Amino acid sequence: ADGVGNASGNWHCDSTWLGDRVITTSTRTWALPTYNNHLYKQISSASTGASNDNHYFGYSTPWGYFDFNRFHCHFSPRDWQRLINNNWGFRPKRLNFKLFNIQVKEVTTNDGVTTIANNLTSTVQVFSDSEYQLPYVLGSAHQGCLPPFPADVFMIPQYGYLTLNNGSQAVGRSSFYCLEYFPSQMLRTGNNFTFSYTFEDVPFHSSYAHSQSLDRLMNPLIDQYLYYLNRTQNQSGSAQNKDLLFSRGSPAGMSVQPKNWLPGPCYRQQRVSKTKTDNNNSNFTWTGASKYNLNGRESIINPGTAMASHKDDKDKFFPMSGVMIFGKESAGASNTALDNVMITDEEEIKATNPVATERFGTVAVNLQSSSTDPATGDVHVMGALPGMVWQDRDVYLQGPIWAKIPHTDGHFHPSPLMGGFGLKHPPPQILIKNTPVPANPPAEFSATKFASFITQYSTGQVSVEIEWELQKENSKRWNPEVQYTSNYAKSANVDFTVDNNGLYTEPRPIGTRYLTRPL
Amino acid sequence: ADGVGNASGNWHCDSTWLGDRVITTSTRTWALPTYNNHLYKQISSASTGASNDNHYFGYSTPWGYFDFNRFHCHFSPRDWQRLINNNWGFRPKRLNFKLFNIQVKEVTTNDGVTTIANNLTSTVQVFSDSEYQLPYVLGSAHQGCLPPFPADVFMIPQYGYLTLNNGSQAVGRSSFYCLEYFPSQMLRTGNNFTFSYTFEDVPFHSSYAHSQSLDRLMNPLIDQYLYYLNRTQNQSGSAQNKDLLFSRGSPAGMSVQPKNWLPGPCYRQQRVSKTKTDNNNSNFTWTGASKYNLNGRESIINPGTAMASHKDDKDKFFPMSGVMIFGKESAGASNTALDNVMITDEEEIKATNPVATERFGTVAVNLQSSSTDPATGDVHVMGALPGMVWQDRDVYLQGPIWAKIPHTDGHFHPSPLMGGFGLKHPPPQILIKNTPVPANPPAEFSATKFASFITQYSTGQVSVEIEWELQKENSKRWNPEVQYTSNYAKSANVDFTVDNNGLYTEPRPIGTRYLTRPL
Amino acid sequence: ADGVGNASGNWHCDSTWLGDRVITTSTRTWALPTYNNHLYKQISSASTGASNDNHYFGYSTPWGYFDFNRFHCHFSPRDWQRLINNNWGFRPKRLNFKLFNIQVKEVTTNDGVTTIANNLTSTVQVFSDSEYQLPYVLGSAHQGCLPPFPADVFMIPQYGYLTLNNGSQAVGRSSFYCLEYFPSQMLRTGNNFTFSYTFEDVPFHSSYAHSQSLDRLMNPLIDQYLYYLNRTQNQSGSAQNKDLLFSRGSPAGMSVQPKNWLPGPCYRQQRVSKTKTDNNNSNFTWTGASKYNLNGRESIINPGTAMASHKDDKDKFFPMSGVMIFGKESAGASNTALDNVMITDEEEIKATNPVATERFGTVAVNLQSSSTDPATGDVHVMGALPGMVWQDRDVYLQGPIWAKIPHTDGHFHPSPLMGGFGLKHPPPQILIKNTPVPANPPAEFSATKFASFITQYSTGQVSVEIEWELQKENSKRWNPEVQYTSNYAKSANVDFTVDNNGLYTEPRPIGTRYLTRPL
Amino acid sequence: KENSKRWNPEVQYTSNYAKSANVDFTVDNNGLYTEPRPIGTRYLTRPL
Ligand SMILES: Nc1ncnc2c1ncn2[C@@H]1C[C@@H](O)[C@@H](COP(=O)(O)O)O1
Ligand SMILES: Nc1ncnc2c1ncn2[C@@H]1C[C@@H](O)[C@@H](COP(=O)(O)O)O1
Ligand SMILES: Nc1ncnc2c1ncn2[C@@H]1C[C@@H](O)[C@@H](COP(=O)(O)O)O1
Ligand SMILES: Nc1ccnc(=O)[nH]1
Ligand SMILES: Nc1ccnc(=O)[nH]1
Ligand SMILES: Nc1ccnc(=O)[nH]1
């Protein structure tokens, strides 16, 4: 239960702050079509003339899925502000899902005149793959998430997946999943669906920027008790003579003092400028791109290793594929102008992580001697070395929240490369589909496959509640900190607001790293 | 109860393995038309010019029936694999039926424009003939079973039956059953129907192949203590002279050692080749066919006695009507090409059962003496002889499960000749029908039969749960066994999968005999 | 325990009669060699030029096995007499096995002078395959059983088995068993092995002959109330005219009276005479032999269906392969003279079973009419028909006791065709082997297979106790019955006795059918 | 144990059924045990 003329759920949609806790609960109203005419279909790069690196094999499903894996699905711009401006970190604790006031309509089109009526007896099916038995497509930054603006109605994305492929063909080990082979709950107007999940223990997300840097971590007023080789050729003597002179760590030469740690790992990336003139005249997008080679296919590393987007005084350049880029509502599908996208800046970590477009360092390459000169080389790729420390890619008000850690034998610091929390057991995929309704069948039994169905779609609200744990700050810093603030200068439109046509717009990407914390 | 806007059942459809048990529960969504305009109709071969062997008399009913008598209605291809690759046998224990979310629509066609609306007050009737008072039509391999692929919608078959006939006429002892003369439950959207049955004690199905053969069952290293007549004419003596020389069972002559058992019974069948050239140029399909003669009418024995489909090294031939043949989805109604069907191979039993196209053996036909020579003959038909042992026809992922043992005075090893379990009291026939809805009647009483009805059909889901009992294996075999495995070699489509158009396809027939067990 | 100088078992070997019970317990002393040098070896008809029907594939094992599957292993001639002369039937109930006083000797041969010494620390391994996981070779009438005469020392047979074969090659489904992969108990002089088994419920063996025959089972003094068609052509009328005259069952014509039952099933066999002159001059041994065809290979049916060895007054002929034949101690391996074997006579069942060399009967083959004459044919092979009754092949003092019913889907009256009790779970195979003893190994590690071993054999006593259940007789017969009796007439040697050289000899084969019982 | 919701059959290690002179992982006519090929453990499927 209960009934047809009885709401099966209310509009819960608030935000509650409780010291070290904050419950965000937002509800949006959705629309679900009938996909593929209730058919599972094999799909492939086959006959697309697709590049060799773009081949793929998989299946498109008749099911739709719920996806709220974006911060703006839960935090209003103002809340996000509250969060990033006063806390050193946060993480998800537990969540709550709910489907209600579901209504199934049946459209009868004819003579251009289409009519929409209720089919009070139709059902919609749901089920959460809580045992992760289906391929996981959440956490690949796809569209179809809950809209940022509560007053927006959205369309549920269609669920499709991929599997092992050799060119545009499949292989023996390829897998095909049928979602109807999963116990799922059926609903009619008066029914509703609910379910709760608990997040696994996960590190707080570092919502702060360091107020010191690895190199500048010593006492500016005092020497060290350590010495380093300072000269191998004596100064003057009106001749250049071989020697071995040592000096001891001085504040006057911090760049040469023995230290305890190393910058973060790094996989260098090409650098491009926001002013076309500076760029080389060619299309190096794929040519000079940092790609990884997985079984014959190349794939751009994007955004790849967390690295400072640019060195100080140069928010002019950016890693060719080392920064998150969101599109403004104006941006088109492909080859859209620069001012139609928003490129994130990850320079807040230049204090501990290597800059993405530069060399990580220099390495000795030979054995110097009186007869052969000491040579070196530039290291462009650097794996994990003991003593390394680093910061992970920051998250954004419109970025991903989590991603499922692949189920592999081993894995290194599994933090989703494009921002987020790495979960061994993430929130499960919620699958929904309209059950088929056979149109009038022949008056004489026919065994051939049924392919005539009442055309219909469904609609209802969905509520998602998440309890977040805050990590308050207690900086003993004396001077004011940086804080996200809307510009007070007058203008035609207000940031994160609708316009004269009712189109909600997210002007810029907001990070979370404003508050300071020493190393 | 309960209501209109309230689902009366969920989509249970899983599979659970519990050591020696396995519960398969699958649910499909169905569509039921109005058959015969709610009329019972007499039907016969009368005026069809039908052959003499094809005459028949019976009645077609306004009712529809549920039929899930095919393994693929319960086992997914993968499950079937699990089953056949690790168990020596299995059998049904108990089942559970359920009808729900039933919806009755009423189509109003006009001007080519047809409209489908709900008739919230209409009813559908169901009832299980649990006392087997109606002619049993399940277990005759008819279409209309639950689809293999869960996502398929199917049409319920129409229930018709036959009775005693003399040509195209009926006889005094002929029977006519009216299904409305059975207490049946009526349902409206909010209602549902449920019922459970328990299988009778039945032998496990032999899901294994023998790793020895009747003839080769002795100790290869040792003689016997028995002797046999070896020669009746002395060897050499530069003359051929009468004699009586005996030898004793030696490994050097196993084909002549006294044994304890005999191969299985046999009723020889003609042999045809898959390469037309080898075949005789004529249409012997019926001509040289093995037929039985029951009261003036002939009927092909098909598949008849369980016999090896061909001797070793010849999966090229096959019994003309001694093997199960399923059609690929491409196969047509009649006279379709070879590669549109799939012919089962029953050679796994050549170890104990006679080959179907050969003679069972040789028999002495006279009394030899010095004056008359010892003659013999080929035995083509062999009834049960004491000491006989045999294997029954294997079952297939897309074959029958059970059949009702006819209610006759006697019966021999009643295992359904075309595969399956012989049940004295099988799952009952589930009958369903849409109750008639008189269209507007005349405004003045008329006693003549009512023949104007609201045109309508119904639809809903049906769930069938079966608990199967497994007979695990404990072979002390040392070397690996054969196992059903999908080919790993790359290809365009995956076996037992949908294609680019959403058409599910069962590439080959899967048996159950892979594991080995000695005699 | 216990010790080296301590007997681990006594010589139990008696026979006890207890009304309806009789416990036979006999013990013999055995000798076990080292077979195959402790090696498992693949063996086949490969490269033997062996006939096509004699091909085979299998493995010879390093193990030996105990076999007491012959009546004379438990019954002395006198006991057998007691049994067959006073009981209407008997069957096995439970048994007891025991291995003791085992001694392992190690032979050191050299310069023709061989020396035998005790290896007090060597072990012998035993184990009963009580789960029937190994191919069963008992019940194939092989040599190596316990000797009839208690004072005889015997050699344990070597255990080998066969498996699926295609010519002299193997197949995928072929099985290879390693006996070392079975938990087995190890023994040194002071140890012993014991185990008990219980026979399954089985019909008593019919140790009697019928004192009536199927045809002559009515009242000689009274008519029947039934009539039969006696003439179809009127007698006399000085003309032969069509008619229909009926008579009623009279004692004067028993051969034509309606009856209730039919003789036993039958598969005709060629007939040969003990006096070569009567026989046809040719070698029809295989030519005109009744053979069965199992997957390309032919095999003589021997002894096949239980049938009377010859009609009354003709103990001169015999079925070419329808009677058991034991060899006298003088008989050679092959092509030995008639008087070196003993051919059993199964004429005691001519009262209910068909004679083996004759036709079972006559059958109508056409539809007679004034224009076409009534023809018939001789039926040489007859399967089981309802109403059939029959007697099984008798057992002999030196014949088999039981056989394992093959593990097949179905089987008909599974009584071992060559005499005995058909057991689903027979006494298990007892396997014994001398554990290898590495000779001195190289002084420097070598991974190659070890192939140098101390040459040794073992010896000890084995006791087998079986409790048999008797079925006493209570015939109300007035005249004396036939009884097995040794001839009283004087002669040079006593039957079932040793001769001047100490060679025990079993003069003739003794059946069990002497006592009478009406149908 | 595995609980793949996969629908199509998986790959499985299986001895070849085609006839031949010797059986895999078996002794020969001389009693020499032989391991014909190396068997891995990766046959069953599991999504990432
Ligand atoms: N930023 C981060 N750094 C390290 N680990 C993180 C992380 N975010 C999430 N994790 C994961 C969550 C858990 O999966 C844990 C790894 O668990 P396991 O893979 O060894 O079974 O750390
Ligand atoms: N493979 C099989 N072999 C023998 N019997 C089988 C069988 N499969 C099913 N049966 C039946 C099931 C039960 O009907 C039983 C026969 O019962 P009744 O007809 O004497 O009353 O054996
Ligand atoms: N002379 C005989 N006649 C009939 N059956 C006999 C027999 N001697 C032994 N049996 C077997 C012993 C048991 O195996 C029983 C058959 O058991 P199941 O094969 O149906 O499981 O009858
Ligand atoms: N960081 C890690 C250390 C060891 N093993 C892993 O899988 N990951
Ligand atoms: N196998 C059978 C034996 C006896 N009667 C039967 O009806 N069936
Ligand atoms: N005698 C028999 C009747 C029915 N089934 C059998 O296997 N055997």
Find out whether B193 and B99 touch, Cβ atoms under 8 Å: yes
d(CA B312, CA B307): 13
> Residue C325 pairs with which residues in a beta bridge?
C343
C-alpha dist (Å) from residue C278 to A86, B244, C289, C347: 120, 11, 18, 21
Q: How far is the CA of B422 from the centre of ligand 2 (A)?
A: 6
d(CA C372, CA C454): 84
Q: Is C165 exposed, middle or buried (0-12, 13-18, 19+ CB in 10 A)?
A: buried
**Contact B414 CB / ligand 2 (< 6 Å):** yes
d(CA A205, CA A419): 10
The C-alpha angle with vertex A362 and arms to A358 and A365, in degrees rounded to 5, equals 140
Please tell me whether the peptide bond between C386 and the residue prior to it is cis, using omega within 30 degrees of 0: no
Find out whether A384 and A354 touch, Cβ atoms under 8 Å: no
D33 CB neighbours in chain C (<8 A) are 40
Lookup result for tokens 């062997």: B53
**Contacts within 8 Å (CB) and 24+ apart, B167-175:** B167/B45, B167/B52, B167/B55, B168/B44, B168/B45, B168/B46, B168/B47, B168/B48, B168/B50, B168/B55, B168/B56, B168/B57, B169/B44, B169/B46, B169/B57, B170/B44, B170/B57, B174/B57, B175/B135
Q: What is the DSSP letter of C221?
A: T
C-alpha dist (Å) from residue C430 to A310, B378, C126: 83, 42, 7
| CB within 8 Å: A42 and B499 | yes
Amino acid at B137: V
d(CA C12, CA C25): 7
Half-sphere exposure of B141 (CA within 13 A, CB side): 16
Task: Please indicate the experimental technique that yielded this structure.
Answer: X-ray
Q: In sequence order, which residues have a C-beta less than 8 Å from that of residue B255 and are 6 or more positions away? A: B215, C51, C53, C54, C297, C298, C299, C300
Q: Is B11 exposed, middle or buried (0-12, 13-18, 19+ CB in 10 A)?
A: buried
DSSP percent split of chain C into helix, strand, coil, nearest 5: 5, 35, 60
Lookup result for tokens 């009723």: B267
Helix H or strand E segment including C81: helix C77-86
Report whether CATH 2.170.30.10 matches the domain A1-519. Answer: yes
3-state SS class at A339 = helix
Q: How far is the CA of A402 from the centre of ligand 1 (A)?
A: 11
Q: Is B406 exposed, middle or buried (0-12, 13-18, 19+ CB in 10 A)?
A: exposed
Q: For C409, which residue in chain B has the nearest alpha carbon? A: B391
Continuous H helices in C212-316: 284-287
Chain A nearest C-alpha distance from B497 (Å): 7
d(CA B24, CA B90): 13
For ligand 3, atom 9, which residue shows the shortest CA distance? C422
Q: How far is the CA of B57 from the centre of ligand 2 (A)?
A: 30
Q: What is the DSSP letter of D43?
A: -
In this complex, which of B77, B480, B497 lies closest to D14 when CB atoms are compared?
A: B480
Residues near ligand 4 with C-beta < 6 Å?
A: A 410-413
| CB within 8 Å: D3 and A133 | yes
Rounded to the nearest angstrom, the gap between the alpha carbon of residue B505 and the centroid of all alpha carbons in its chain is 20
d(CA A91, CA A420): 10
C-alpha dist (Å) from residue A138 to A64, A132, A400, B368, C180: 12, 12, 9, 87, 54
d(CA A116, CA D9): 43
Tokens representing A52?
């060799």
Residues found in chain A: 519
**Contact B406 CB / ligand 5 (< 6 Å):** no
Resolution expressed in Å = 3.0
d(CA C151, CA C27): 9
d(CA B202, CA C365): 40
Find out whether B415 and B405 touch, Cβ atoms under 8 Å: no
**Contact B410 CB / ligand 5 (< 6 Å):** yes
Find out whether B316 and B271 touch, Cβ atoms under 8 Å: no
d(CA B121, CA B188): 6
Alpha carbon dihedral B498, B503, B509, B512, in 10-degree steps, equals 50
* Closest to B431 in 3D by CA, of B27, B11, B28, B61: B61
Find out whether A505 and A497 touch, Cβ atoms under 8 Å: yes
Q: How far is the CA of C409 from the centre of ligand 3 (A)?
A: 14
Phi/psi class of residue A118: alpha, beta or left (left: φ > 0; alpha: ψ in -120 to 50)?
beta
**In testing the pocket of ligand 6, which one of C411, C413, C415, C424 has its CB within 8 Å of the most ligand atoms?**
C411
Tokens representing B177?
């059953």
Question: For residue C341, how many other CB atoms are within 10 A of its CB?
Answer: 22
Lookup result for tokens 């009515």: C218
- Phi/psi of residue A265, nearest 5 degrees: -65, 170
In this complex, which of B217, B248, B481 lies closest to C333 when CB atoms are compared?
A: B248
Q: For A434, which residue in chain B has the nearest alpha carbon? A: B151
d(CA A287, CA A290): 9
* Closest to B355 in 3D by CA, of B388, B390, B394: B390
**Contact C202 CB / ligand 3 (< 6 Å):** yes
Phi/psi class of residue C488: alpha, beta or left (left: φ > 0; alpha: ψ in -120 to 50)?
alpha
Find out whether A515 and A481 touch, Cβ atoms under 8 Å: yes
3-state SS class at C186 = strand
d(CA B11, CA B28): 9
Helix H or strand E segment including C86: helix C77-86
Q: Where does chain A break, by residue before each gap (C–N > 2.5 Å)?
A: none
Helix H or strand E segment including C112: none
Please tell me whether the peptide bond between B339 and the residue prior to it is cis, using omega within 30 degrees of 0: no
**Contact C392 CB / ligand 3 (< 6 Å):** yes
C-alpha dist (Å) from residue A77 to A81, A83, B248, B440, C209: 6, 10, 100, 63, 106
Find out whether C251 and C222 touch, Cβ atoms under 8 Å: yes
d(CA A12, CA A97): 11
Continuous H helices in B251-343: 284-287
Helix H or strand E segment including B130: none
Find out whether C34 and C434 touch, Cβ atoms under 8 Å: yes
In this complex, which of D9, D23, D25 lies closest to B484 when CB atoms are compared?
A: D9
Please tell me whether the peptide bond between C53 and the residue prior to it is cis, using omega within 30 degrees of 0: no
Residues found in chain C: 519
Chain A nearest C-alpha distance from D14 (Å): 14
* Closest to B351 in 3D by CA, of D20, C404, C163: C163
d(CA B427, CA B132): 10
Q: What is the DSSP letter of D26?
A: B
Tokens representing C130?
């009580």
* Closest to B387 in 3D by CA, of B471, B262, B278: B262
Half-sphere exposure of A471 (CA within 13 A, CB side): 16
Residue ranges of the domains in chain C?
A: 1-519
Q: In sequence order, which residues have a C-beta less than 8 Å from that of residue B126 and are 6 or more positions away? A: B99, B184, B185, B187, B193, B430, B431, B432
For ligand 2, atom 11, which residue shows the shortest CA distance? B422
Q: What is the DSSP letter of C428?
A: P
* Ligand nearest to the CA of residue A416, numbered in listed order: 1
Q: What pairing do the DSSP bridges indicate for beta strands A402-404 and A87-110? A: unpaired
Q: Where does chain B break, by residue before each gap (C–N > 2.5 Å)?
A: none
